[PDB]
């Protein structure tokens, strides 16, 4: 098990509204991984873009971690690490940006 408390992009268990209050004041590409208060042990990537905070479910299925079925990872850390370098465009044309800046910057 990986301890995600280490990373400056992990916000723990935090509500959707609190996330839009926290991220609205930052540049596009600022992101955080949070745990969804309504689904225990399920996570979300929240990322500011176009002056609005977008939210993406992290699905866990058949031991894969993924935000699109077309690209899968062994772990949440590897997911985040891939999308820090490769734009979300390849599966979210609504959202052309990498995970550039963790919110604790």
């Amino acid at each position: 098990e990986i301890d995600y408390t280490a990373y400056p992009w992990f916000a723990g268990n935090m509500e959707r509204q609190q996330t839009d209050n926290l991220l609205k004041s930052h540049a596009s590409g600022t992101y955080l991984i949070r745990e969804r208060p309504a689904e225990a042990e399920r996570f979300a990537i929240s990322i500011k873009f176009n002056d609005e905070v977008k939210h993406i479910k992290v699905v866990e299925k058949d031991n894969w971690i993924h935000i699109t079925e077309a690209k899968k990872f062994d772990s949440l850390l590897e997911l985040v690490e891939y999308y820090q370098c490769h734009s979300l465009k390849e599966s979210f044309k609504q959202l052309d940006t990498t995970l550039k800046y963790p919110y604790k910057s």
Partner: peptide
């Protein structure tokens, strides 16, 4: 739904 949808 509620979140963002892929593709």
């Amino acid at each position: 739904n509620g979140y963002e949808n892929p593709t």
